[PDB]
């Protein structure tokens, strides 16, 4: 399987395969970690320029991604890999054949939840150790305690408490002592998403029937409930710019924004990501910024910004709708044909079964543009089956020819 002439380098044209992306900050630079098959990529949020790519491909696909300053944790099969600038530093191997599902890192604790409702806890060897490596203990949730594990969360100002969220209800474990400190009341609807709020002791829970629940753990009771009938929540996120805003992503591909202060809908971004590919898989506000990053399974990553209000007074009322800021994307289906665009090896042309022709950059800028199909005078075209390009006369006239499936003519394109 190993070549003596070739070795894989990276992948061009993938931003995200649908696994939720992880965010973090290095000093003043925000970064976004996205899974692309058996390797991950780190972008700079300010410019969406590629910073690091994982050195090697994992043996299996990555199921989870967690990012903590300089260290990126990637879970695949029964192993969790710890990477720094894309280089594998330490590999954690769990003792059970059960595959990892979810991942939470707080302080010196690393928590991994398997498909068999077992939670593995790891701790740092030394308080100054950079990542947890040692095996601390094992905590397993049984059917009597709760349902299948939905996500692992940690609330701020909780000493050694891990807020396990299951389909049935929420559970609180003290990882140090491994005991069930608190069990939540059963919920009628299946929980699908969990998001800690920027407030103390409240965690937002998203259900399968368009319900968002800001559950207070300390008081152990419901505080507020937003209704989204005929919808399924896929992502939740709170704005930390000083505005009590909540962004709710749905599997239908829509992203709604609520003003918790005024109990009203600010705006809805319709069909930002395809419903067929899972809608909005992940949507997160950047910490302290009016910028929200959104991702989906359709191979697209977008950023929207909330501009300052245009009203000198009552700006909280008059909220500018979110404005598209920048994005990276690619084909929604595997590319059918490829070609190197120029002799310098700076760009590549690509055609896929999604009936789109794309140009991808081979540099860190990671730029990507779909060539316009708007026709000259004098739905997408069928999939390309053959393509030829020249550069002798680029800028003078057409320099590309393509053949389309079940079509009796060939089309020309101008690079």
């Amino acid at each position: 399987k190993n070549s003596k002439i070739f070795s894989p380098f990276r992948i061009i044209g993938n931003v995200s395969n649908g696994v939720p992306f992880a965010t973090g900050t290095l000093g003043s630079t925000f970064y976004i970690v996205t899974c692309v098959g058996k390797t991950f990529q780190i972008y700079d949020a300010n410019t969406l320029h590629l910073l690091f790519v994982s050195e090697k491909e994992t043996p299996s696909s990555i199921v989870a991604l967690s990012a903590h300053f300089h260290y990126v944790y990637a879970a695949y099969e029964n192993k969790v890999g710890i990477y720094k600038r894309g280089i594998e530093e330490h590999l954690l191997e769990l003792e059970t054949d059960a595959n990892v599902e979810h991942l939470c890192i707080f302080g010196d604790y690393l928590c991994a939840s398997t498909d068999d409702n077992s939670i593995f806890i790891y701790k740092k060897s030394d308080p100054q150790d950079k990542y947890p490596s040692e095996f601390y203990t094992k905590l397993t949730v049984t059917e009597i305690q709760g349902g299948e594990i939905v996500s692992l969360q940690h609330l701020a100002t909780y000493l050694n408490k891990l807020t396990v969220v299951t389909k049935s209800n929420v559970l609180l474990f003290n990882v140090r002592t491994g005991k069930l400190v608190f069990t939540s009341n059963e919920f009628p609807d299946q929980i699908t998403t969990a998001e800690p709020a920027p407030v103390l002791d409240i965690i937002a829970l998203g259900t399968v029937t368009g319900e968002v629940i800001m559950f207070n753990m300390r008081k152990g009771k419901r505080i507020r409930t937003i209704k989204i009938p005929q919808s399924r929540i896929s992502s939740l996120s709170f704005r930390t710019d000083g505005s009590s805003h909540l962004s709710v992503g749905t599997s239908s591909g829509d992203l709604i924004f609520y003003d918790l202060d005024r109990r009203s809908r600010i705006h809805v971004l319709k069909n930002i990501h395809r419903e067929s590919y899972g809608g909005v898989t992940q949507a997160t506000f950047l910490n302290g910024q009016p910028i929200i990053v959104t991702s989906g399974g359709d191979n697209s990553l977008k950023e929207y910004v909330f501009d300052p209000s245009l009203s000198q007074g009552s700006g909280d009322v008059v909220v500018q709708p979110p404005r598209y800021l920048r994005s990276r994307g690619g084909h929604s289906q595997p590319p059918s044909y490829i070609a190197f665009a120029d002799s310098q090896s700076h760009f590549m042309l690509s055609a896929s079964k999604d009936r789109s022709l794309w140009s991808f950059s081979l540099r860190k800028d990671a730029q990507s543009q779909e060539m316009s199909q708007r026709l000259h005078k004098k739905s997408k075209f069928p999939e390309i089956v053959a393509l030829a390009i020249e550069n002798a006369r680029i800028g003078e006239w057409e320099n590309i020819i393509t053949a389309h499936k079940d079509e009796k003519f060939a089309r020309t394109w101008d690079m």
Binding site: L26, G27, S28, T29, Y31, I42, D44, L51, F52, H70, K84, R85, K130
Partner: peptide, 14 residues
């Protein structure tokens, strides 16, 4: 002091 502590993608790991 006498020493910049820069946390960047290329440094500041420690």
């Amino acid at each position: 002091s006498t020493r910049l502590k820069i946390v960047d993608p290329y440094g500041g790991s420690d």
